């Protein structure tokens, strides 16, 4: 499954498919973005199938409704939404486009990594850990980006020695997940990205 979105700001290309054989999808996602501002999400359950998906769509389902709120307190209510269950892996980014500003906090194995025309990348380490219930020390990143950054946000089933060549090559959202598609092909396990690309 594909869904692009375009604004003055950004352009959006999401990627989903499920491990082969599989009828529910451990992972999820939410993007929203209007003329101000995005909020994206990715997520990836604990366990397997449906019970990981109660997981992965709880996240989904708080990162809409309290889009409004910080990275850090988003993240904390999906934290305590996890009590009872089994968990996740999960990252949490907000953009303000007028400030070209972002903030990002992650705990788990999803994956973020933006290029910078100039050849700076963020790309932080992954944090130990999910999303238990239990307490966090989380840490949130703040920066400004600069216009032509290319951004994506990946699940564990993406593998790829090298993002930052992708990103850097491609022209568009379209382009790198297109260059992306041999790392699509075998399906061992959920895969899941949210492509951007900042004007
Ligand atoms: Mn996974």
Redesign the pocket.
């Known amino acids: 499954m594909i869904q692009v979105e375009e604004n003055e700001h950004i352009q959006t290309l999401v990627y989903q498919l499920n491990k082969e054989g599989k009828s529910i999808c451990?992972?999820s996602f939410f993007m929203k973005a209007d003329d101000k501002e995005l909020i994206c999400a990715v997520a990836?359950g604990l366990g397997s199938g449906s019970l990981a998906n109660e997981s992965s769509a709880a996240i989904k389902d708080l990162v809409e409704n309290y889009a409004s709120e910080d990275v850090e307190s988003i993240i904390e209510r999906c934290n305590q939404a996890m009590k009872n269950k089994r968990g996740a892996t999960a990252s949490i980014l907000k953009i303000n486009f007028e400030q070209r500003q972002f903030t990002y906090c992650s705990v788990g194995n999803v994956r973020f990594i933006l290029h910078s025309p100039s050849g700076e990348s963020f790309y932080p380490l992954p944090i130990s850990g999910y999303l238990s219930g239990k307490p966090q020390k989380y840490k949130t990143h703040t920066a400004t980006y600069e216009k032509g950054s290319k951004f994506i946000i990946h699940?564990?089933?993406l593998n790829v020695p090298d993002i930052r060549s992708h990103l850097k090559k491609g022209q568009s959202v379209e382009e790198i997940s297109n260059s992306l598609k041999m790392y699509t092909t075998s399906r061992k396990?959920?895969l899941t990205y949210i492509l951007g690309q900042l004007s």
């Open positions: 451990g992972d990836d699940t564990d089933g396990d959920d």
